[PDB]
């Protein structure tokens, strides 16, 4: 939770605070190489996710993808790119910890294994866990009214502005995120209860507290992202090198 | 204290959300009738609105709060019932009301009626948000969430593998 | 009822569960209809001011003024319309 | 190979071929009269060659039936709704009645 | 009284279904004839808008 | 049958059993398996690429082999579009001209400026 | 836009009648090949489905006639020369409409039975909750077209004021250039092929039951959605999963 | 709506009627729960197949080979049709 | 004249006609739209006005037909001047 | 010469007897025709 939520956001803060206000001309010269690298990060990691077996590893690969979108935006020399790449980092640090809680402190606590092949049919005996899985899955992929869409859209606005081709070929993340997340959500919530797994309790109130916080926060910034502008209206323009 | 457009937009939202919060307390019987009746009230609002628009044809708007005013980009949650919108509403609202009444007799014997009726009204509310919205963004919201709701409805029999 | 089969009772969902029809639902149905009606009224009365007809709000003389000023800015900045460059 | 003309294994085989041919007729044909006509024609085509004794010609005939059945396959066979290839198979499975095993000493 | 091979009896359909079925068929066929009478030249293409030659 | 991808992984298996894959969708449904939905018995060995060869995998089709299927699909499409091109050479002439409009093609009401008439001017008159 | 409004009314009705059919039968099958002759058993479901099919076949006075024939006409009435072919493709789509509609009607109501007996002992019309929506939707598919064609398809309506480019406006030419042949052949054929395939299915059913190996393969193509369902999975999805594992 | 249920007697009545309509049977009044197909009723090794196909269409089933070839008795077929909840 | 008087640009702008209908025949479209707006756009309502505007535009159609006849005649003339 | 009989015909006969013949399979079709013909004649008389 600490890693995905914060330590990967440090890399973004490092760009904005060390690499852009200085080294401006190197950014505007070497940006296309960044777009190459971020684009390969997006698609290859998403496709690598389609053929994994461990639950926690899949959420991890998604974190690589959303950071790579956020790099397209912050490294785009535009205001909307900065305000999107930041909002991606925030909403990602709300959504991903919830998923790592679901797959690492719920299921692994109950049954002590992370292989998808065992898991199937939670909806029958663990319905509330099903509801949370689908909500967080549709927030991860970037369903609107969630910060993980508003940040996707804005970063892809700015990435399209800088290089339209790369910023449009990177729109397939809107699809590939849905593929590697829904192929899994369908398995878990779907089917008849696994013979390998006995029954255990539904989610307890402690975990329900956590997931409901991490969902209220992202729904808020998904509904009115403008609240975060009062801190960032300078930062969207300090780091823009345009004559 | 009357608003065709406000009532068109909130009543379906009531019928989608209240069952999800209160279904164990209310039972599938009352839920079927409440969602049916509220979506009936909505259809009457649209037929009468259709009459008025034929009389005058100045569309009503509904300019709500700001989603994003950053830099050369103002996106509000605006809503409007224009001519094209009121026709799409006639199809949506009429068909959804009929289906909410037909899916009482078809879905008796089914244990999970509450979630079924909540989803039908969910789809109705989100298409209403689609046809109404006065900007492409409010359209994209309805675009995505009806596809979400379609996943849940087609998956309504979660045990049936092919449905998933 | 018809076509039923057993089901666990400890399973709890915000929704019914299996064939949910508690022996108090008339009262809870009353509470829910009351809240829903109050919400619908609060919303309609709140959104009334934020309505407007598409037209009738802005006089045409204001539109003519604004289009005049548009021409003024365009010629001060020495700009030409679309297609004239031919 | 040794496909014996008067043994149980050939009986199982030819009974399966007869079942399959009849179902193929029932799936391909709409009307009922023509279904009964084709059924009777197939029973005739079978009784005509129930009498063979040489294993070689027998096995050649079985191969010809295999090729024929492969040549009149149906892509959307009629199957009952509550049975595997049907529309109502695992619709409402009665959940297995299980008891709550516990995992933690303090949490429910 | 189930003849598992016999000629089956006539179905015992209710009145609301026999009454309403006849009502819808009446209104359908009446709406067809009334429209066709008032609109045959248009659907038959008998008005020749083309100029005389 | 072992496909390309499934026998390019031969050098890597080490000790793992080199199973011959068979998708479960073609396994007999009428047999009693432990996991009746996925058509798998408990200690059944798994292929290295079982994620492709289970029931949650994309559906196979057993009627047409896929090459003939591609022939049929593209042949239908090409027939349709080629007929739709060829039949543009067997088209009758229009019985009347396009409509024409009074004020010089309505260049003013289409947003003209007396020099962009080519861009905005509708039909002559 | 007008065909959307109609298409809702005369299609949701069909799906509701399909449900009342499917539940009157014991095992909830969805195969016409095992329905037969429920006409005497299910009259109300029958009259409703045939209304929608005729509102789908553009019978006179029903919504589908107004909503559909006019599009078949504007294909001829367009200023573009190459759109003439689309008239025929739409016309073949129309005669196919009357085909598959009457097929369902014969196979489900007029034909000889093809289930067991008990299905016919227990067939019964469904409750009030099912009928009344089919009643109202039937009223809409009967009357909405003539009630609303003055708003949408009218001459100078101004209700849906989309700023048409004048160069592309052809509704006047559509309604006037069109001749008798090009105004009747759709309606004639919709009646005639409909009645015909009924006659063939009821008297000369061999014609659909040749058991030729070159016809049956073409039936296999048009079943399975022009094998596209097998193109998609194998060449796109499966060659995405393998590339993904690569 | 579909207020209908099956019973062992009803299945027996329908099976014997199905067999009474079969021309290649020896003769009536041999048909009983203890009736064999190959010995008593005097049927070929394909008439048993046709009879099983007939029971399928009658009670709306799908009987595979490994369950069909073991039907050598009418009471066996009754116990089988009683061992399918969807026996119509 | 089978056509009525052409409207001026300003009365067109005043009634807010659509540009496809802003042609020679626009004078009779105005009362028709007014009667429709009055009668709630029902079909039994303004049949006379509809008949008027339809006949007027049919007259325009026949004029355009004769112009196409002229164009075909001229091209055949040019053809049998080329040989 | 090509003519054979089905051993099941007594079973397959109820698909062709009463309320399943070429008459009864086509009676309830056009269920409300006659009343509407009479009404259309009455209304043309009412002109
Ligand atoms: C090779 C590298 C590709 C890199 C770029 C990405 C390309 C597009 C994405 C393809 C990548 C492979 C996707 C694999 C995901 C598979 C996930 C899965 O296992 O679910 C299977 C599912 C189908 O489920 P199925 O088994 O068929 O069930 C039906 C039975 N009821 O599968 C599905 O439902 C399919 C979901 C994907 C739908 C994509 C459809 C594309 C069709 C394009 C046709 C051309 C249209 C023209 C486009 C214009 C472009 C200018
Ligand atoms: C937009 C911000 C969020 C809005 C609030 C939505 C959450 C409300 C609580 C729902 C409880 C519930 O739906 O129940 C949970 C259902 C239970 O099914 P059941 O009907 O009770 O029967 C019980 C029979 N079992 C036990 C066999 C299932 O689990 C599921 O089958 C998985 C479906 C999840 C539906 C999700 C609802 C739609 C929300 C999607 C918006 C992204
Ligand atoms: C381009 C031309 C190709 C069109 C496809 C031909 C299908 C061949 C076939 O024989 O299919 C016939 C079926 C009707 O058969 P059925 O008796 O109603 O039941 C299905 C019985 N089968 C499975 C044996 C087919 O489809 C049709 O009604 C097509 C009639 C042609 C109408 C053209 C107008």
TrEMBL record, chain B:
The protein's superkingdom reads: Eukaryota
Residues that bear N-formylmethionine: 1
Domain NADH-Ubiquinone oxidoreductase (complex I) chain 5 N-terminal, residue spans: 68-117
Compartments in which it is found: Membrane
Bilayer-crossing residues are 6-23, 30-50, 83-102, 114-131, 137-158
Q: What does the similarity note say? A: Belongs to the complex I subunit 5 family.
Function, in words: Core subunit of the mitochondrial membrane respiratory chain NADH dehydrogenase (Complex I) which catalyzes electron transfer from NADH through the respiratory chain, using ubiquinone as an electron acceptor. Essential for the catalytic activity and assembly of complex I.
- The molecule here is called NADH-ubiquinone oxidoreductase chain 5
Please tell me the species this chain comes from.
Yarrowia lipolytica (Candida lipolytica)
Upper classification of the organism: Eukaryota, Fungi, Dikarya, Ascomycota, Saccharomycotina
Q: Which gene encodes it?
A: nad5
UniProtKB/TrEMBL annotation, chain D:
Membrane topology label: Peripheral membrane protein
Keyword Acetylation appears in the UniProt entry:
yes
| Entry keywords, A to Z | Acetylation, Electron transport, Membrane, Mitochondrion, Mitochondrion inner membrane, Respiratory chain, Transport
Cellular compartments annotated: Mitochondrion inner membrane
Q: What is its main location?
A: mitochondrion
GO biological process entries: mitochondrial electron transport, NADH to ubiquinone
Q: Which GO terms describe its cellular component?
A: mitochondrial inner membrane
Specify the superkingdom. Answer: Eukaryota
User: What is stated as this protein's family in its record?
Assistant: Belongs to the complex I LYR family.
What protein name applies here? NADH dehydrogenase [ubiquinone] 1 beta subcomplex subunit 9
Source organism lineage? Eukaryota, Fungi, Dikarya, Ascomycota, Saccharomycotina
UniProtKB/TrEMBL annotation, chain F:
From the entire protein, which fragment is shown? 25 to 149 of 149
Using the UniProt annotation, give all residue ranges assigned to the region (Disordered). 106-125
| Residue intervals passing through the bilayer | 70-91
Give the keywords, sorted. Answer: Membrane, Transmembrane, Transmembrane helix
Lineage runs: Eukaryota, Fungi, Dikarya, Ascomycota, Saccharomycotina
Out of the domains of life, which is the source? Eukaryota
Annotated protein name in UniProt: Uncharacterized protein
What cellular component GO annotations does this protein have? mitochondrion
UniProtKB/TrEMBL annotation, chain J:
Q: Does this UniProt record's set of keywords contain Repressor?
A: no
As for membrane topology, the entry says: Single-pass membrane protein
Instruction: Using the UniProt record, give the first listed, main subcellular location.
Output: mitochondrion
User: Where found, per UniProt?
Assistant: Mitochondrion inner membrane
State the GO CC annotations: mitochondrial inner membrane
Q: Which UniProt keywords apply?
A: Electron transport, Membrane, Mitochondrion, Mitochondrion inner membrane, Respiratory chain, Transmembrane, Transmembrane helix, Transport
The Gene Ontology biological process terms listed for this entry are: electron transport chain; mitochondrial respiratory chain complex I assembly
Q: Which family does it belong to?
A: Belongs to the complex I NDUFB3 subunit family.
**What does the UniProt record say this protein does?**
Accessory subunit of the mitochondrial membrane respiratory chain NADH dehydrogenase (Complex I), that is believed not to be involved in catalysis. Complex I functions in the transfer of electrons from NADH to the respiratory chain. The immediate electron acceptor for the enzyme is believed to be ubiquinone.
Q: What is the protein name given in its UniProt record?
A: NADH dehydrogenase 1 beta subcomplex subunit 3
Species annotation: Yarrowia lipolytica (Candida lipolytica)
